[PDB]
Amino acid sequence: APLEPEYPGDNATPEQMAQYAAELRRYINMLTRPRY
Secondary structure, three states: OOOOOOOOOOOOOOOHHHHHHHHHHHHHHHHOOOOO
């Protein structure tokens, strides 16, 4: 209930996407956790 990232929808501009990807990356990080 990272509620989630947010994604515009496509491509906001030639980077957003980048940004955006960074946001979920964090997201996963957070959930995964490994443990172990």
